[PDB]
Amino acid sequence: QVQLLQSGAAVTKPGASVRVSCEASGYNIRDYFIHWWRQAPGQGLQWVGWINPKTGQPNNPRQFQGRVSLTRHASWDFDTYSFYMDLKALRSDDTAVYFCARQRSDYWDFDVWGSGTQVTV
Amino acid sequence: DIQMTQSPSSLSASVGDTVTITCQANGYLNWYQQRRGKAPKLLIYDGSKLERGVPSRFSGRRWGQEYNLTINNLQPEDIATYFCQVYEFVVPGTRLDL
Amino acid sequence: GLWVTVYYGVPVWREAKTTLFCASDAEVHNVWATHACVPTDPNPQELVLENVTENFNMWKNDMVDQMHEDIISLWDQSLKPCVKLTPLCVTLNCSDAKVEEIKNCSFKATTELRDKKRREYALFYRLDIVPLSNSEYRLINCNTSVITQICPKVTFDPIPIHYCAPAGYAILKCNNKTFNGTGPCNNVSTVQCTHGIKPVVSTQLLLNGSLAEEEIIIRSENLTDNVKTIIVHLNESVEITCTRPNNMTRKSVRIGPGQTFYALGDIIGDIRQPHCNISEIKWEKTLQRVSEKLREHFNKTIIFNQSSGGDLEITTHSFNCGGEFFYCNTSDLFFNKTFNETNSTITLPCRIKQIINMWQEVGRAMYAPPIAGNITCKSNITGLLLTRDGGGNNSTKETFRPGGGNMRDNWRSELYKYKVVEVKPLGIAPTECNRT
Amino acid sequence: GLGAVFLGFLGAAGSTMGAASNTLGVWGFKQLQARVLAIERYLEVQQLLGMWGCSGKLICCTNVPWNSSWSNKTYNEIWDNMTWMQWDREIGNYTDTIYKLLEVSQFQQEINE
Amino acid sequence: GLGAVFLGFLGAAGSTMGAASNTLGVWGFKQLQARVLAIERYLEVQQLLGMWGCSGKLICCTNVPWNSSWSNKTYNEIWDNMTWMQWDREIGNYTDTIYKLLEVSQFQQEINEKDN
Amino acid sequence: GAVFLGFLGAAGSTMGAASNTLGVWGFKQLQARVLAIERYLEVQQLLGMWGCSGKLICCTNVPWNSSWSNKTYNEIWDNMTWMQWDREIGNYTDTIYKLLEVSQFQQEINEKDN
Ligand SMILES: *[C@@H]1O[C@H](CO)[C@@H](O[C@@H]2O[C@H](CO)[C@@H](O[C@@H]3O[C@H](CO[C@H]4O[C@H](CO[C@H]5O[C@H](CO)[C@@H](O)[C@H](O)[C@@H]5O)[C@@H](O)[C@H](O[C@H]5O[C@H](CO)[C@@H](O)[C@H](O)[C@@H]5O)[C@@H]4O)[C@@H](O)[C@H](O[C@H]4O[C@H](CO)[C@@H](O)[C@H](O)[C@@H]4O)[C@@H]3O)[C@H](O)[C@H]2NC(C)=O)[C@H](O)[C@H]1NC(C)=O
Ligand SMILES: *[C@@H]1O[C@H](CO)[C@@H](O[C@@H]2O[C@H](CO)[C@@H](O[C@@H]3O[C@H](CO)[C@@H](O)[C@H](O[C@H]4O[C@H](CO)[C@@H](O)[C@H](O)[C@@H]4O)[C@@H]3O)[C@H](O)[C@H]2NC(C)=O)[C@H](O)[C@H]1NC(C)=O
Ligand SMILES: *[C@@H]1O[C@H](CO)[C@@H](O[C@@H]2O[C@H](CO)[C@@H](O)[C@H](O)[C@H]2NC(C)=O)[C@H](O)[C@H]1NC(C)=O
Ligand SMILES: *[C@@H]1O[C@H](CO)[C@@H](O[C@@H]2O[C@H](CO)[C@@H](O)[C@H](O)[C@H]2NC(C)=O)[C@H](O)[C@H]1NC(C)=O
Ligand SMILES: *[C@@H]1O[C@H](CO)[C@@H](O)[C@H](O)[C@H]1NC(C)=O
Ligand SMILES: *[C@@H]1O[C@H](CO)[C@@H](O)[C@H](O)[C@H]1NC(C)=O
Ligand SMILES: *[C@@H]1O[C@H](CO)[C@@H](O)[C@H](O)[C@H]1NC(C)=O
Ligand SMILES: *[C@@H]1O[C@H](CO)[C@@H](O)[C@H](O)[C@H]1NC(C)=O
Ligand SMILES: *[C@@H]1O[C@H](CO)[C@@H](O)[C@H](O)[C@H]1NC(C)=O
Ligand SMILES: *[C@@H]1O[C@H](CO)[C@@H](O)[C@H](O)[C@H]1NC(C)=O
Ligand SMILES: *[C@@H]1O[C@H](CO)[C@@H](O)[C@H](O)[C@H]1NC(C)=O
Ligand SMILES: *[C@@H]1O[C@H](CO)[C@@H](O)[C@H](O)[C@H]1NC(C)=O
Ligand SMILES: *[C@@H]1O[C@H](CO)[C@@H](O)[C@H](O)[C@H]1NC(C)=O
Ligand SMILES: *[C@@H]1O[C@H](CO)[C@@H](O)[C@H](O)[C@H]1NC(C)=O
Ligand SMILES: *[C@@H]1O[C@H](CO)[C@@H](O)[C@H](O)[C@H]1NC(C)=O
Ligand SMILES: *[C@@H]1O[C@H](CO)[C@@H](O)[C@H](O)[C@H]1NC(C)=O
Ligand SMILES: *[C@@H]1O[C@H](CO)[C@@H](O)[C@H](O)[C@H]1NC(C)=O
Ligand SMILES: *[C@@H]1O[C@H](CO)[C@@H](O)[C@H](O)[C@H]1NC(C)=O
Ligand SMILES: *[C@@H]1O[C@H](CO)[C@@H](O)[C@H](O)[C@H]1NC(C)=O
Ligand SMILES: *[C@@H]1O[C@H](CO)[C@@H](O)[C@H](O)[C@H]1NC(C)=O
Ligand SMILES: *[C@@H]1O[C@H](CO)[C@@H](O)[C@H](O)[C@H]1NC(C)=O
Ligand SMILES: *[C@@H]1O[C@H](CO)[C@@H](O)[C@H](O)[C@H]1NC(C)=O
Ligand SMILES: *[C@@H]1O[C@H](CO)[C@@H](O)[C@H](O)[C@H]1NC(C)=O
Ligand SMILES: *[C@@H]1O[C@H](CO)[C@@H](O)[C@H](O)[C@H]1NC(C)=O
Ligand SMILES: *[C@@H]1O[C@H](CO)[C@@H](O)[C@H](O)[C@H]1NC(C)=O
Ligand SMILES: *[C@@H]1O[C@H](CO)[C@@H](O)[C@H](O)[C@H]1NC(C)=O
Ligand SMILES: *[C@@H]1O[C@H](CO)[C@@H](O)[C@H](O)[C@H]1NC(C)=O
């Protein structure tokens, strides 16, 4: 029953902005963190940050610091929370696939993942 | 600080034999199963603890700073990328083509 | 002979859990209901054990968990009897205020006759309400919760309270001058009844707390992990005091039989933007000492930066001051504050919010009635809440940011040296005595 | 009832074995629950003591010897080297067994008369 | 306190007197009532014994003579053919009278040791 | 409960002569039961620690210093009742309780090594 929706793949010109949407509805969202990962071709996963559902406090590395902004927006009822991800400037090497994960039990283990969104530049 | 190492980076073994991969790091470690273009799947967490749903064939061993990953009784659909994941560092995985 | 024998009243204890009751020291109803709490002893016993060692992990302590549970229940109980502000949020037609800090506008409300209705004007802060779309607004929270006015009589000011164990149980506290949350401590004393623990509420800067001693104590569940917060504890407190110069007015608007609520009525005198003042030279040295203490735990240069973002609760410093709730920038203190290897102050402009989502559990909110006259409150900063960026294997930089990860960490600072435990006075020792 | 008597036992907890001998609302329901727990605790010690023949005695003496499996040590090491803390865990595994044989020892004394 | 020991007395209920010796919510408020009810019963038994001169002794004798009005049967028959239950039925009317006479005996006995 | 009322009998008689002779209902009652039971144990708690754990009249080995009182034995149990006794010593009852307590511990140790 636990699953995460994902937005469709989109392509934008350099210097534009892109929006990626992740939804969680099968559990108590407020009790678990959400993390974002990037999978560019030719190399392993790269961390992006996490957003606390209880309060939208992001935490990001310096590589994307100042550009990526993580925001949460609950539905009318406190279920089916939607997690977004916006970045201002896109470089020529930002082509990758962005995932949506979940943290639990004090361990950085991700039992639920999103389908991913493929974006070019 | 956190240190990561994946010495083999590539492993080709027959089907039905015993195969394993080597990852060295400090701190909590987890293993994931990544296919071609599909989301990674969690196999074992906390170094050796098993997950609900994954077959019992997958197993690992916690030894000091050395982490094993024992793979036995291979079946098709078990050939995909493996990588060890500490909190923030994830080095490229190793392939189990054949 | 080697004959068994039973000794009563022996020093044996084991980890145990129980419920602790409230106690208070020394006319008007209080939210904490300190009248119910039994009076404290004039001189609590502070017996100290001679030569014994014990270890405990405060992060697994349940004294803090129980404190959060009953404090939450106490606030709910106080709000049960007095009115709920559900009818107020209707289509509001607001344009501007003659005096966007404050907005003046009116609404249609019920009167003594239910069928009849009247138009009454009231003043609300801009952030209190939200726009429906032009010129129409509603209260920030009516499509996802129910707002309840806080009873005007009760006072929310914190008063020291004692979490005091029952009979047959003891509380162990050790006074190791430098000691973080986890690890053994060899100077442990048994105190039946705990000392003052003021239930202060804050998000970024801990205030009105006990000072450290001999060190700048730094505590966190795990330094390597980034999710967990880091709690600072300053041996030298920093005095922060500020007042809002504006003068308010009280107005009464009424919606049901015997039910009345208080809304901001009018502004007296010239409108002036409230702010807060902190010392320049004193605060800078405070962060320098903190930076030095953080360096040895990471072996990298320490840098500070403002909060990443989020709702107004965490991104701005918040506290209670004379019955008013503040949300202040506190950004000048953590902006470009990289550390190298007068009579000026720090101005921190900010404003006040009426509708507050405190105790961030889904279901309900609160409304703070206004009070005429200015408010003055002087507080001392003791400890900070920080969150490491955690940007991978950084070269030499470990930029830090403020922000309260969880509200429970407010009280963990003052409970880092405490542990409830049960004592068993029975034992079976070896002796040669044998009954006739 | 009074907790001061319980406190005094904790005094000299770290002292050696021999040295010890020589030397309507939230507030009101929790208080009631704690009070009921406090009174219940006291009778547990009294109930065990009463059935072992201990009637208001600080130190008792029974008529049951030791089993060799419990421990093999003499007086001097026990009473001048160890403390109540680590010593208790040595016999703690056999605490339940000793209780059963201690009650019957007092019961069989009463039937004799 | 513990009720397990109380049920222990009930063993061999049908055996003779001589043979017996030889051998916030409803869930939480009901529990509290049981705990308060249970603890009182334990002290009620102790309170009677404490003022009878017996301090928890399982078998305890006294010096009050047995009045023939209540009952007069040979000792062997009572403890060899009768059961503990039938004893209460016939004496149950006179238990209150027996209880009162015990109290004065202990009061008199202790006072005598003082005057001597 | 009736036993407590029994003590009040012959209150005015001299000490010597006396010896010779869910809702509102449900919670208030519950509080009384826990209050009454506690009071019974407070008296019993002190008695047990002093060595007399149920005797109607105890017998102790603590000397009567002249500090607290000074009067003949005859004029104690013949002219005044128990009520007046409390006022003359009521201020110092804490001192006697502590001094009498330590006597029981000292006696117990002397019995153990015997
Ligand atoms: C913050 O989070 C981090 C996680 O990122 C966390 O890190 C943990 O830190 C603790 C200690 O603080 C680590 O636990 C230590 O583990 C040591 C090594 O354990 C392994 O090796 C043991 C023996 O092998 C060693 O020695 C041989 C030579 O004999 C050598 O060849 C080996 O290479 C290796 O060096 C082995 O016994 C052990 O397995 C036992 O223990 C585990 C539990 O740890 C148990 O599950 C097993 O069943 C088995 O019983 C393991 O394989 C270990 O030596 C060390 O022990 C110290 O304390 C004991 C106390 O008696 C001493 O006797 C001993 O001499 C050592 O001084 C300790 O247990 C843990 O491994 C880290 N986590 C990870 C994932 O690595 C931090 O603690 C967190 N911080 C806070 C504040 O929370
Ligand atoms: C940290 O602690 C300090 C020290 O207590 C605290 O500052 C103090 O706050 C209290 C309010 O909580 C102030 O007391 C007020 O003083 C003014 C001026 O004298 C009074 O007018 C106020 O009266 C109100 O309360 C009365 C009783 O409830 C009502 O009858 C009356 O109508 C008013 O509503 C009130 O007594 C106190 O003056 C300050 N102390 C100083 C030195 O300014 C500070 O707020 C604490 N920090 C935090 C974050 O809480
Ligand atoms: C609080 O702790 C800090 C950090 O230990 C102390 O800062 C030291 O102050 C002395 C004063 O002479 C300096 O010599 C040191 O260089 C400072 N740093 C360190 C790391 O010691 C500060 O003095 C303490 N304040 C109090 C009141 O105890
Ligand atoms: C907080 O500090 C500011 C200074 O930044 C004070 O503002 C000054 O107030 C005096 C009052 O006579 C004026 O003469 C100055 O021109 C003001 N300067 C500025 C920059 O505003 C303010 O009064 C202080 N407030 C408190 C409560 O201490
Ligand atoms: C409530 O209405 C406001 C105003 O349109 C809107 O901003 C907010 O998202 C709504 N919340 C819910 C839970 O419907
Ligand atoms: C598996 O664990 C054993 C522990 O004895 C270790 O010697 C071995 O090297 C590990 N596997 C690999 C591939 O390193
Ligand atoms: C404990 O400390 C005391 C002095 O405080 C000393 O007399 C005693 O020998 C010590 N015991 C141990 C086991 O170190
Ligand atoms: C504080 O703890 C340390 C160990 O972390 C210890 O060495 C030191 O002696 C303790 N302080 C005192 C005053 O004993
Ligand atoms: C606390 O201090 C001890 C002293 O050695 C240290 O081992 C431990 O890692 C410290 N823990 C934290 C959270 O600072
Ligand atoms: C333990 O703390 C007390 C606090 O007053 C102090 O008097 C005592 O000297 C300390 N003992 C040690 C060994 O640090
Ligand atoms: C602030 O309140 C004080 C009360 O002591 C008063 O004297 C002063 O005039 C007030 N100032 C303003 C600007 O309202
Ligand atoms: C708000 O506007 C109404 C409009 O009639 C006016 O009567 C009222 O005085 C205004 N409020 C203030 C504080 O001036
Ligand atoms: C810590 O840094 C110093 C230099 O600043 C270096 O000499 C030392 O090796 C470092 N230690 C660790 C454990 O990285
Ligand atoms: C601090 O944050 C600001 C935000 O824009 C950024 O411009 C600046 O480079 C940061 N400084 C450091 C040292 O991280
Ligand atoms: C804090 O001040 C800075 C500049 O003074 C401003 O950019 C920032 O928006 C302020 N904080 C908030 C929450 O508006
Ligand atoms: C931060 O402030 C320092 C000190 O004035 C300055 O050198 C640096 O350029 C500033 N950085 C930014 C991003 O504003
Ligand atoms: C201003 O505020 C003070 C607060 O002490 C109050 O007494 C006074 O009535 C208010 N109005 C004026 C005009 O001072
Ligand atoms: C804050 O703590 C310091 C510590 O000595 C004290 O001097 C000061 O009075 C405190 N502040 C207030 C407002 O009481
Ligand atoms: C207690 O000691 C006496 C005297 O030596 C002895 O007769 C008696 O048997 C001992 N008790 C037991 C239970 O053996
Ligand atoms: C002593 O203990 C052993 C097992 O620990 C048991 O077999 C034996 O029967 C016991 N003997 C007595 C006398 O309790
Ligand atoms: C008590 O028995 C348990 C059974 O698993 C054992 O693990 C433990 O070591 C025993 N206690 C001692 C002191 O050996
Ligand atoms: C019940 O009666 C039978 C027949 O007399 C007897 O054998 C048995 O022991 C009795 N039961 C008990 C518990 O004494
Ligand atoms: C005791 O027995 C005598 C004679 O049998 C009788 O007169 C008297 O009433 C009896 N008293 C009681 C209390 O049974
Ligand atoms: C006890 O009194 C009841 C009262 O109804 C009576 O029926 C019964 O016969 C009496 N039994 C004895 C033994 O006096
Ligand atoms: C009451 O006082 C009268 C004299 O006034 C005396 O005869 C009688 O014995 C007294 N009664 C008691 C119970 O002291
Ligand atoms: C008796 O009381 C006097 C009065 O101070 C005191 O000096 C003396 O030591 C006391 N003696 C005893 C034995 O209590
Ligand atoms: C008892 O103490 C009170 C309070 O100190 C005092 O007023 C009274 O005179 C004292 N009585 C005697 C007899 O000392």
Q: Which residues contact A66 (CB under 8 A, 6 or more apart)?
A: none
Of F37, F42, F108, the CB nearest to D58: F108
Chain centroid offset of residue C151 CA: 20
User: Measured in angstroms, how far is the CA atom of residue B61 from the centroid of ligand 6?
Assistant: 8
Both tokens of residue C88?
């107020």
Give the burial class of C411: count Cβ atoms within 10 A of its Cβ; 0-12 exposed, 13-18 middle, 19 or more buried: buried
**How many other CB atoms are there within 10 angstroms of residue A75's CB atom?**
12
Q: Is D88 on the interface with C (CB under 8 A)?
A: yes
| Length of chain C as a residue count | 436
Of A33, A55, A76, the CB nearest to C143: A76
Residue nearest to atom 2 of ligand 7 (CA): C51
Chain F residue numbers touching D47 (CB-CB < 8 A) = none
Q: Is F55 close to E110, i.e. CB distance below 8 A?
A: yes
Among C295, C389, C393, most B C-beta atoms within 10 A, so best to mutate, is C393
CB contact residues (below 8 A), chain C span 199-238, against chain B: 224-226
End-to-end CA distance of chain A: 35
Q: Under the phi-then-psi rule, with left for phi > 0, alpha for psi from -120 to 50, and beta for the rest, what region is A106?
A: left
- The span from the CA of C147 to the CA of D29, in Å, is 28
Q: Which residues contact C12 (CB under 8 A, 6 or more apart)?
A: C423, C424, C425, C426, C427, D84, D85, D88
Longest dimension (CA), chain E: 60
Ligand 3 atom index nearest CA of C235: 1
User: Measured in angstroms, how far is the CA atom of residue C54 from the centroid of ligand 8?
Assistant: 13
Among F56, F57, F73, most E C-beta atoms within 10 A, so best to mutate, is F56
The CATH H-level superfamily of B3-95 is Immunoglobulins (2.60.40.10)
- The span from the CA of D71 to the CA of D91, in Å, is 8
Among D2, D16, D26, D70, most C C-beta atoms within 10 A, so best to mutate, is D26
Residue A54 is given by DSSP the state S
Half-sphere exposure of C101 (CA within 13 A, CB side): 12
CA neighbor of C417 nearest in space, from C60, C205, C176, C89: C176
Phi, psi (rounded to 5 degrees) for C411: -90, -15
DSSP per-residue string spanning B34-73: E-SSS--EEEEETTTEEPSSS-TT-B--EETTEE--EE-S
Give the residue carrying structure tokens 């063993």: E11
Both tokens of residue C401?
């940011």
- For the Cβ of C177 lying below 6 angstroms from any atom of ligand 8, the answer is yes
Q: Which domain holds residue A43?
A: 4-119
Of D40, D56, D110, the CB nearest to E59: D110
Amino acid letter for position C178:
T
Ligand 24 atom index nearest CA of E94: 14
Instruction: Say if strands A96-103 and A81-87 run parallel, antiparallel, or are unpaired.
Output: unpaired
Phi, psi (rounded to 5 degrees) for C8: -105, 130
Q: Do chains D and A touch, with touching meaning 3 or more CB–CB pairs less than 8 Å apart?
A: no
CA neighbor of D59 nearest in space, from D20, D104, D111: D20
The domain limits of chain B are 3-95
Question: Which of C233, C236, C239, C414, when mutated, tests ligand 18's pocket best, judged by the most ligand atoms within 8 Å of its CB?
Answer: C239
Domain count, chain A: 1
Long-range (24+ apart) CB contacts under 8 A made by D100-106 are D101/D64, D102/C4, D102/C6, D102/D52, D102/D62, D102/D64, D103/D51, D103/D52, D105/D52, D105/D53, D105/D62, D105/D63, D105/D64, D106/D51, D106/D52, D106/D53, D106/D62
**How many other CB atoms are there within 10 angstroms of residue C269's CB atom?**
9
CB contact residues (below 8 A), chain C span 386-415, against chain B: 390, 392-393
Give the residue carrying structure tokens 């000299």: D12
Is the separation of the CB atoms in B36 and B59 below 8 Å? Answer: no
- The span from the CA of C277 to the CA of A84, in Å, is 37
Give the residue carrying structure tokens 């902006």: C335
Both tokens of residue C344?
């000026």
User: Measured in angstroms, how far is the CA atom of residue C424 from the centroid of ligand 20?
Assistant: 26
End-to-end CA distance of chain B: 36
Torsion angle of the four alpha carbons D6, D9, D10, D11, in this order, in degrees rounded to the nearest 10: 130
Q: Is A107 close to B30, i.e. CB distance below 8 A?
A: yes
- The span from the CA of A22 to the CA of C402, in Å, is 27
Residues from A in contact with C at Cβ < 8 Å: 30, 33, 47, 50, 52, 54-63, 65, 69, 74, 76-78, 103
Phi, psi (rounded to 5 degrees) for B19: -135, 145
- The span from the CA of D60 to the CA of C431, in Å, is 10
* Chain A residue nearest residue B36, CA to CA: A41
Helix axis angle, D26-51 to F24-49, nearest 10°: 40
- Which helix (H) or strand (E) segment holds residue A55: the answer is none
Q: Do chains B and C touch, with touching meaning 3 or more CB–CB pairs less than 8 Å apart?
A: yes
- For the Cβ of D22 lying below 6 angstroms from any atom of ligand 21, the answer is no
CATH of the domain at A104: 2.60.40.10
Of D21, D39, D57, the CB nearest to F41: D39
- Which helix (H) or strand (E) segment holds residue C118: the answer is strand C117-125
